């Protein structure tokens, strides 16, 4: 038996993990690697023609998208309904196979957990003024953006971006430059992705920066997700579904988190230090359907009346 896979998930991270499939399963993985969003693009091109039986993609955005076009399959309850809401589709079409978050990332040196204002809407106060990193062009930035402009409006969204960009802000490319600026005292506070910095502390221990999150609902701690889905299209949906359980197995979910540096989505996994329980996430996350991030060009948009792009 094989299936083909959809990956918007790099080879080198993906690889190790298909061939285990491999050889626990007998089933062989024929994978397209190509960027998340181009890849929901072409599925929504194939339609019903499509070869592809499952896509992994690392963007709720494109997923959501998916979803809208009605090209994904409702996965069997078995699989998704004893997920944490934050980690799987309401109705059953996707779910989350790693936790891709918002944090906030401080200087151990220059700052502490106490300076962290309860909602990312504070840190355009004068208290932060040339403290922190903006990356306005990673996509986790942006679908960021979308899921704030999903729960506050575009106003609310708007004045925040023009505060932000009046607070004077350093500019980097991404979250590693943010992180390593830290390091480098050119900024106390980053706004990232949860999976980079757990990189820098497997390389160095002691590397001066810890991330946490706002206050308990808070759309700076929003979860985005590394979902996956079975096209509706597909005739091999059992295969399909036992790659993802897969997926969601405990020696899969522990190597996400302990490798990768994403959140696993299940409980029983040894917590990446960095990160810390699975239970303060769940406690920390925003209430958001991920498949409302499908919106990028309205967030691109705001970005470039904020003068942000
Ligand atoms: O494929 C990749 O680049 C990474 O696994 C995921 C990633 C991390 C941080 C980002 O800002 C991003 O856009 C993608």
């Known amino acids: 038996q094989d299936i083909t896979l959809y990956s918007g998930r790099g080879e080198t991270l993906v690889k190790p993990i298909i061939e285990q499939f491999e050889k626990q399963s007998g089933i062989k993985v024929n994978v ?6 181009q890849l929901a693009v072409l599925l929504q091109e194939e339609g ?35 997920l944490p809401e934050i980690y799987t589709s309401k109705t059953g079409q996707w779910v989350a196979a790693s936790g891709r978050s918002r944090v906030i990332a401080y200087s151990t040196e220059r700052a502490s957990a ?7 809407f504070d840190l355009t106060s004068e208290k932060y003024q040339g403290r922190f990193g903006l990356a306005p062009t990673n996509g986790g930035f942006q679908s960021f953006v979308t899921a ?22 350093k500019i980097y490319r991404n979250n590693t430059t943010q992180i390593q ?7 106390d506070f980053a706004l990232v992705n949860n999976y980079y910095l757990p990189r820098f502390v497997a390389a160095n221990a002691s590397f001066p920066a810890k991330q946490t999150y706002f206050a308990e609902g808070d ?13 509706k299209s597909s ?11 897969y997926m969601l197995s405990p020696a899969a979910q522990q190597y996400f988190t ?11 996994i040894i917590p990446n230090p960095v990160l810390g329980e699975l239970d303060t996430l769940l406690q920390a996350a925003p209430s958001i359907d991920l498949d409302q991030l499908a919106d990028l060009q309205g967030t691109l948009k705001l970005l470039r009346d904020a003068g942000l792009l």
């Open 32 to 37: 397209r690697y190509g960027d998340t969003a």
């Open 48 to 82: 019903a023609r499509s070869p592809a039986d499952v896509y992994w993609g690392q963007d709720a955005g494109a997923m959501g998208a998916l979803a809208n076009a009605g090209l994904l399959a409702t996965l069997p309850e078995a699989v998704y309904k004893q």
């Open 114 to 120: 106490e300076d962290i204002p309860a909602s990312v």
């Open 148 to 169: 704030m402009r999903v729960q506050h409006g575009d106003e609310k969204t708007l004045a925040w971006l023009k505060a932000m960009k009046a607070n004077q802000p």
């Open 181 to 187: 600026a830290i390091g480098d005292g050119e900024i």
């Open 219 to 231: 759309i700076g701690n929003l979860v985005n997700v590394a979902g996956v889905a079975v096209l």
């Open 235 to 245: 005739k091999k949906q059992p295969q399909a579904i036992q790659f993802i359980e």
């Open 258 to 268: 302990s490798v990768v540096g994403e959140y696993p989505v299940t409980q029983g």
